[PDB]
């Protein structure tokens, strides 16, 4: 997989600085090599990762990281804490779901009283 990895990471390196060199390369060459550029190709996702990462390296270029031992420890503790929190959210969710299953299983689906006869993902948010 070394080839795929290398091309992904390279086109990701260039794509991280300009985003114009790849959009020109695609039209210039015409090779089924960069087929990962479309969000259709699975690997594309990992691509979006690498680029981001490189984009990140561009963040603090010219800035050094001076984290000390104490600090690193504190940080890892806080990360742990976070993980625990997330775990708790997962638990709660599972619980609520359980309740729902119980009630759904426990209501009269024969108490009918009808009247007539015959995108939500971006909607299930807030703005």
């Amino acid at each position: 997989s070394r080839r795929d990895m290398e091309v992904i990471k390279l086109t990701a390196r260039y794509y991280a600085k300009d985003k114009s060199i790849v959009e020109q390369m695609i039209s210039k060459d015409g090779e089924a090599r960069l087929n990962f550029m479309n969000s259709s190709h699975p690997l594309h996702k990992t691509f979006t990762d690498f680029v981001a990462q490189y984009k990140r390296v561009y963040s603090f270029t010219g800035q050094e990281i001076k984290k000390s031992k104490r600090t690193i420890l504190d940080n890892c503790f806080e990360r742990t804490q976070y993980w625990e929190f997330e775990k708790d959210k997962d638990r709660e969710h599972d619980k609520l779901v359980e309740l729902c299953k119980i009630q759904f299983a426990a209501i009269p689906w024969d108490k009918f009283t009808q009247v007539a006869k015959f995108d939500l993902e971006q909607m299930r948010l807030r703005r």
């Binding site: 009630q103 209501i107 009269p108 689906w109 108490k111 009918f112 009283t113 009808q114 009247v115 007539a116 006869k117 015959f118």
Partner: peptide, 18 residues
């Protein structure tokens, strides 16, 4: 029928010929 239910309120149905 596409029945919809909530604890207090009464059930509701919608006929689906298709």
């Amino acid at each position: 029928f596409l029945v919809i239910a909530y604890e207090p309120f009464e059930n509701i149905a919608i006929e689906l010929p298709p």
